[PDB]
Design a protein around this ligand. Structure first.
Ligand SMILES: C[C@@H]1O[C@@H](O)[C@H](O)[C@H](O)[C@H]1O
Lengths: 218, 212
């Protein structure tokens, strides 16, 4: 059994997005359906439920009046209409099926089938590619690249077009007060290689179609 | 209903047995489930109705408890058991679910002091109007670390941000970046930039510094 999840996106505050899940391999109309989310740095949060026959719904206080859950028991789909979006609604969203009864021992109070997760980002920032600055090396040396002031997530970083992987750490992005993200990618290498090996950080930001190859030199 | 999970982080050696606790603010009978969650993946059901293993879940995960006190036992940590584990409750009406805050399970290893590096702002960034100073703490264990910025001996507050990698798949260490952000104006107003690093693998804290 699967719930095949789609939708989401990146929008301005006060705007709207839709999420959808399509049922596969079970009888959709026989089960209550839920949405659950996880915001950055936070735990799982229950969002909403709709009963099997779509006759009753219920919402977390945090989203009541702004999100609308619905289902289509003909197309066997589940929807979450998210209106009036707030920055704190930024999260990975999952759809979830109520667990099965089994003649007494099993309850419907767990979640047995989950959608893969789909990202919703709410921000006043608009799409912007990163600036990329070298972190030049001062037995072991460290060097890196600062990938600054981009939106939205994610960026990808490789070194020497993937040839360098040992010792690489690309840090999670931090959201700056500006609303833009920033991260660093570093690598530690033998001090001997500083003179013979070329180090190039390859930065790709698909939302802005930005690609930067920055050489980092002693 | 509030579900309280402890410990916040559970550190286990490979092969070590571990117990995760979930305590409900009032009785929930056996209506208590457990999920495993890894970044970028959907939560994976482990245990239903306090003690029933979800299909396909190996026996090394077991759930116990009733009423207010619940446990998830991992009889011996395997490397891909590193994850955040959540407990969860729901009842008939009202129908909303509640989750515990999560217990992060990580691999325990020997202490490793960080190697520490500092990076002045590049000429390029300076030419672009802002100044970022970066401090790197490389491959340390455990995760607990303290980084403080000083500019001409003045402790900085509110103008730095930290970021930490997930536990390394090969050597089970963490790495950390701390970045101090100043306007170019303020950056050129001062001379000495210093990063003070405290970690239990270090006898006394390490300072890295440079003159602008
Ligand atoms: C919305 C509905 O409410 C109750 O009838 C039960 O909790 C059921 O499992 C749920 O789907």
């Amino acid at each position: 059994a699967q719930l095949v999840e789609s939708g989401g996106g990146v929008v301005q505050p006060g705007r709207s997005l839709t999420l959808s899940c399509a049922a596969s391999g079970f009888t959709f109309s026989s089960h209550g359906m839920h949405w659950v989310r996880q915001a950055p740095g936070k735990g799982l949060e229950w969002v909403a439920v709709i009963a099997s026959h779509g006759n009753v719904n219920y919402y977390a206080d945090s989203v009541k009046g702004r999100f609308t859950i619905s289902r289509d028991n003909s197309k066997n789909t589940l929807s979450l209409q998210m209106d009036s979006l707030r920055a704190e609604d930024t999260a990975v969203y999952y759809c979830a099926k109520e667990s099965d009864s089994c003649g007494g021992d099993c309850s419907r109070f767990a979640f047995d089938v989950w959608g893969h997760g789909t990202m919703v980002t709410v921000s006043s920032a608009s799409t912007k590619g990163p600036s990329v600055f070298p972190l030049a090396p001062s037995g072991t040396a460290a060097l890196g690249c600062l990938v600054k002031d981009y939106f939205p997530e994610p960026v990808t970083v490789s070194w020497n077009s993937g040839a360098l992987t040992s010792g690489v750490h690309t840090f999670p992005a931090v959201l700056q007060s500006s609303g833009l993200y920033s991260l660093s990618s570093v690598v530690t290498v033998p001090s001997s290689s500083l003179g013979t090996q070329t180090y190039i950080c390859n930065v790709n930001h698909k939302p802005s179609n930005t690609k930067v190859d920055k050489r980092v030199e002693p | 209903i509030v579900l309280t999970q402890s410990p916040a982080t559970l550190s286990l050696s490979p092969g070590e047995r571990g117990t995760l606790s979930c305590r409900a603010s009032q009785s929930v009978g056996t209506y208590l489930a457990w999920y495993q969650h890894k970044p970028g993946q959907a939560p994976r059901p482990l245990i239903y109705d306090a003690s029933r293993r979800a299909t396909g879940i190996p026996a090394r995960f077991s759930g116990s408890g009733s009423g207010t006190d619940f446990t998830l036992t991992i009889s011996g940590l395997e490397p891909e058991d590193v994850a955040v584990y959540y407990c969860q409750h729901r009842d008939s009406w009202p129908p909303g679910a509640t989750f515990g805050g999560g217990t992060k399970v990580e691999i325990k290893r020997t202490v490793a002091a960080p190697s520490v590096f500092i990076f002045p702002p590049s000429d390029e960034q300076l030419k672009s109007g802002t100044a970022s100073v970066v401090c790197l703490l490389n491959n340390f264990y455990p995760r607990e670390a303290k980084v403080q910025w000083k500019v001409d001996n003045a402790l900085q507050s509110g103008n730095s941000q930290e970021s930490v990698t997930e536990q390394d798949s090969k050597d089970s260490t963490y790495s950390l970046s701390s970045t101090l952000t100043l306007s170019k104006a303020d950056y050129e107003k001062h001379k000495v930039y210093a990063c003070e690093v405290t970690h239990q693998g270090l006898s006394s804290p390490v300072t890295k510094s440079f003159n602008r």
